[PDB]
């Protein structure tokens, strides 16, 4: 139900409260440029035979002018690493549909460093601008871990990712994490894209910046567990979130924010659709979210105001009947039980409760 203030298991913003949470408000003064893939400075398939090589060319050439990297339609089994740079980059697929350009690997966090080297090592020379990223993953022991599982890794501000598909196809056990896209910087724009995985598909805001903003438009994102997770200020407008049933069909969760308690703006889902495989429709065993209580050992170790306290608003979106309609928010990764504040008067930034809220959603799951 969408009546404010809601229930302790499903709090709903008041009309007045809703006015504090809008695209403009989450943008925090950032005015995103129009995406306009109007040219190709570097073309993978007409000048570059790996994507990394085109990225490297654009970064190494320097300057302040936005550079456009076109990726010809095709399937690319490689990583794409954007190290920190002042060059604004737009990387876009050359096909008619974003499904026509696919960057994909089966590369879970559990991947050994030797296997990682075999899989991607030939993309990197020690002189290249992203070598330190590669080497930091290559130099691990045992497993590369969650950050190093990332297929497309953005550590530069002002990157635009457009009209393409990024996939980490690892579904080898029910315990594997495998990141498709990871963003670590401010002013990232993802438009008309498809982000595919299972657990930890999209690492949205992996960095420490107080202001680390990303804007997703017209984008399709799938997974089953914590498939949109992290700490950025991330806006998702006209997006689709799809809970897959092909790896698992017991107990899914979409969002896992670890938003800093002093950060007002975590995740904003607006005019979007939350849906999934039919199995969940009859199951109702998916959750909209849980807190990623990063660095918190147990529920006993949670310090209100210091520990992360994930922030998420789903507003004016379609929620299909795939979720637990009475209790869509589940236990945090720490074991900290979900607690919703449904008092008529309240502080939406209070850290003694979770910060998961809705306003004016519709559909069978609303």
Description:
This protein has seven helices and 28 strands. A hairpin with a 2-residue loop joins β1 (6-7) and β2. The termini are close together. It has a single domain, classed as 3 Solenoid (Pectate Lyase C-like), CATH 2.160.20. It has helices at 15-18, 23-27, 51-61, 113-120, 131-138, 145-148, 278-283, and strands at residues 6-7, 10-11, 42-44, 67-71, 74-76, 80-82, 89-93, 101-105, 152-154, 160-162, 165-168, 181-183, 188-191, 194-196, 202-204, 213-217, 220-223, 225-230, 233-237, 240-243, 252-257, 267-270, 273-276, 286-290, 311-315, 318-319, 329-330, 355-359. By secondary structure, the chain is an alpha/beta fold. Pfam families: Pectinesterase. InterPro entries: Pectin_lyas_fold, Pectin_lyase_fold/virulence, Pectinesterase_Asp_AS, Pectinesterase_cat. Keywords: Aspartyl esterase, Disulfide bond, Glycoprotein, Hydrolase, Secreted, Signal.
Structural features:
366 residues, alpha/beta, Pectate Lyase C-like, ten-stranded parallel sheet, eight-stranded parallel sheet, 7 helices, 13% helix, globular, disulfide bond, hydrolase, secreted
């Amino acid at each position: 139900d969408q009546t404010a203030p809601g229930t302790a298991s499903r709090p709903i913003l008041t009309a007045s409260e809703s006015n504090y949470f809008t695209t403009a408000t989450y943008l925090q003064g950032w005015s995103p440029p129009s995406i306009s893939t109007s040219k190709a400075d570097y073309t993978v398939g007409n000048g570059y035979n790996t994507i990394q090589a085109a990225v490297n060319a654009a970064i190494n050439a320097g300057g302040t002018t936005r550079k456009y990297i076109k990726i010809n339609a095709g399937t690319y089994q490689e990583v794409v690493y954007i190290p920190n740079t002042k060059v604004p980059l737009t990387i876009y697929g050359g096909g008619s549909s974003p499904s026509d350009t696919l960057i994909t690997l089966n590369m879970p966090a559990q991947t050994t460093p030797s296997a990682y080297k075999s899989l991607v090592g030939s993309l990197f020379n020690s002189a290249d601008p992203a070598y330190s990223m590669y080497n930091s993953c290559a130099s691990k022991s045992g497993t590369i871990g969650t950050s190093c599982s990332t297929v497309f890794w953005v550590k530069a501000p002002a990157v635009q990712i457009v009209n393409l598909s990024i996939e980490n196809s690892a579904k080898n056990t029910g315990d594997q994490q495998a990141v498709a896209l990871q963003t670590n910087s401010d002013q990232i724009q993802i438009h008309n894209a498809r982000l595919l995985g299972h657990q930890d598909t999209l690492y949205a805001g992996s960095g420490s910046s107080s202001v680390e903003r990303s804007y997703y438009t017209n984008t399709y994102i799938e997974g089953d567990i914590d498939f949109v997770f992290g700490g950025g200020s991330a806006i998702f407008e006209s997006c689709t979130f799809y809970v897959k049933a092909d790896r698992r069909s017991d107990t899914a969760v979409v969002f896992a924010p670890d938003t800093d308690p002093h950060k007002m703006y975590g995740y904003f889902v607006y005019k979007s659709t939350i849906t999934g495989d039919s199995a969940w429709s009859s199951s109702k065993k998916a959750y909209l979210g849980r807190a990623w209580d990063s660095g918190v050992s147990s529920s006993s170790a949670y310090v209100p105001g210091t520990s992360p306290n994930g922030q998420l608003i789903i507003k004016e979106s379609t929620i299909d009947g795939i979720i637990n309609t009475s209790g869509p928010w589940t236990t945090a990764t720490s074991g900290r039980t979900y607690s919703g504040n449904n008092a008529n008067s309240r502080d939406l930034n209070n850290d003694n409760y979770n910060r998961f809220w809705e306003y004016n959603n519709s559909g069978n799951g609303a």
